[PDB]
Write a protein that binds this ligand. Structure first.
Ligand code: HEM
Ligand code: KH4
Lengths: 75, 411
């Protein structure tokens, strides 16, 4: 499935950069893509800076997908 | 309560260590089943349990047939691996381990730590004396928690403001004050440490101070600098390592003294050296109960075969109670000699902070010896919950002061 936002698109690029991968599904679970701790750290710290929004790690754990994270950065 | 049958004991469950006295369990394992196969529980696989002191050090030193690179504690070992493999010292083998250790040994050797050892004595005494004046207090919160973490943080270069917050994270990382804790809270707590150190190591790579983080940021293994990832991961193992186990050791020394007043008196009246006492405190309170490895090849031990890829768990607390090594193992004896316990492990991965661990215990014993006549438990203590660590969250005590010695300290 294709990204539908500047946000979804940019977030998916961050996922791809961190998971050392390409063509990362927008609704795929971060862990199910083989996502471990230090990856998740680099991921969360980058989203925090690039979008200038305080993202609590807990909320990331609940919604660890490009699709869901977009909504949260928005709302 | 002292359980009798092997089969109904789950070592992965923290509840087991709270509501059982496992002395008979380990004795039976030591004598009749030295290599024992713990069954699988839920999704977790089964694993070998090693309980004899001889076996425990034999395998601690075999980093050729066994590896730390797939986890060294149950929570990672049972998960199938450790993210920090080949990057964090504890879960790295081979030449990367040898190099990364020699880099760290330059700032954790007895030579390098002598300035810090003086500061521990000073800070320790102050906390002890101020707790004596108060009389009634919580020793864990008012004394113990205040030294190990602050010492390692002084070394690493963690700003003072953040230490209280890091302390809160350590209490959830591998142990828990809450009996019912989910793996999620543990996961988040661990990861919030990495998040903190991502930012701090970033600041020090750009603007280097004199601290231990800066030493790592200026160091090389095999002619190439260390990744910000590698440094962050070892800062985790240092902030967590430099804290919990020493903290729990100190608290346990006090609780054990109230039970064994004959031994407390030997220390107070200088009938035993601080060197000798420290070692018994360590053997007695074996804070890290277990550590582990995975087999890389097949092994033959006690006529049984450990297949490549099996988890092997080594039990320090059982090894430190082995009758064949320690005469009257369950006697708290400050004069115990020899005292070649295995609280700090053995072999290539021998505890990096061993000298610092002793130092912190040594100091506490020296302070308690000088400025205290005795102490008493004033309300029931709370245990931590873990299948890896053992110790106390809080310890309510009344400390009977040495007014004579305390007054001379005011100079
Ligand atoms: C009395 C308190 C302590 C206890 C009971 C303890 C226990 C242990 C044990 C058993 C190991 C070996 C683990 C293995 O073989 O996989 C170890 C390793 C280690 N410890 Fe400690 N330790 C203590 C104090 C400290 C302190 C104060 C520090 C802070 C510097 C520290 C940092 C480390 C590190 C970095 C390793 C990994 C070394 C390697 O892999 O080569 N420890 N500790
Ligand atoms: P994520 O993929 O869940 O992983 C987080 C992390 C990178 C931290 C990972 O390595 C992990 O889960 N480790 C397990 C926790 C751990 O082993 N901590 C260090 C143990 S304390 C210790 O070794 C020691 C020695 N002396 C005193 N304490």
């Amino acid at each position: 499935r294709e990204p539908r936002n500047e946000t979804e698109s940019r977030l998916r690029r961050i996922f791809e950069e961190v998971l050392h991968s390409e063509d990362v599904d927008v609704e795929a679970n971060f862990f199910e893509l083989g996502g471990h701790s230090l990856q998740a750290t680099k991921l969360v710290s980058r989203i925090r800076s690039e979008f200038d929004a305080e993202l609590p790690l807990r909320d990331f754990f609940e919604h660890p997908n490009v699709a869901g994270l977009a909504v949260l950065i928005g709302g | 309560p002292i359980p009798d049958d092997i089969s109904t004991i789950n070592l992965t469950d923290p509840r087991t260590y709270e509501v059982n006295d496992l002395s008979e369990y380990w004795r039976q394992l030591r004598t009749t089943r030295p290599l024992y196969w713990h069954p699988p529980v839920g999704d977790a696989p089964g694993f070998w349990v090693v309980s004899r002191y001889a076996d425990v050090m034999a395998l601690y030193k075999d980093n050729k047939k066994l590896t730390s690179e797939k986890g060294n504690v149950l929570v990672t070992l049972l998960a199938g691996g450790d993210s920090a493999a080949g990057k964090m010292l504890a879960v790295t083998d081979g030449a990367m381990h040898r190099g990364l250790r020699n880099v760290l040994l330059k700032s954790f050797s007895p030579q390098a730590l002598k300035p810090i050892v003086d500061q521990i004595r000073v800070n320790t005494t102050r906390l002890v004396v101020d707790a004596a004046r108060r009389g009634e207090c919580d020793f864990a919160a008012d004394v113990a928690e205040q030294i190990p973490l602050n010492t390692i943080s002084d070394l690493l270069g963690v700003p003072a403001a953040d230490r209280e917050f890091l302390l809160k994270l350590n209490k959830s990382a591998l142990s828990s004050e809450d009996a019912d804790q989910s793996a999620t809270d543990a996961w988040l707590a661990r990861n919030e440490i990495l998040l903190y150190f991502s930012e701090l190591v970033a600041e020090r790579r750009a603007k280097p101070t004199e601290d231990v983080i800066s030493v790592l940021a200026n160091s090389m293994v095999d002619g190439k600098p260390l990744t910000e990832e590698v440094i962050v991961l070892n800062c985790y193992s240092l902030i967590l390592g430099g804290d919990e186990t020493s903290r729990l050791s100190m608290i346990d020394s006090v609780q054990t003294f109230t039970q064994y007043p004959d031994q407390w008196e030997l220390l107070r009246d200088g009938k035993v050296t601080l060197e000798s006492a420290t070692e018994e405190v360590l053997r007695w309170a074996t804070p890290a109960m277990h550590f582990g490895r995975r087999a890389v090849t097949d092994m033959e031990l006690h006529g049984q075969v450990i297949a490549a890829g099996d988890v092997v768990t080594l039990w320090n607390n059982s090894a430190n109670r082995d009758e064949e090594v320690f005469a009257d193992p369950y006697a708290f004896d400050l004069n115990r000699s020899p005292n070649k316990h295995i609280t700090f492990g053995y072999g290539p991965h021998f505890c990096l902070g061993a000298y610092l661990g002793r130092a912190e215990v040594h100091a506490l014993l020296d302070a308690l010896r000088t400025y205290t006549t005795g102490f008493e438990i004033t309300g029931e203590p709370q245990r931590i919950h873990s299948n890896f660590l053992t110790g106390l969250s809080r310890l309510p005590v009344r400390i009977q002061p040495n007014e004579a010695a305390i007054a001379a300290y005011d100079s």
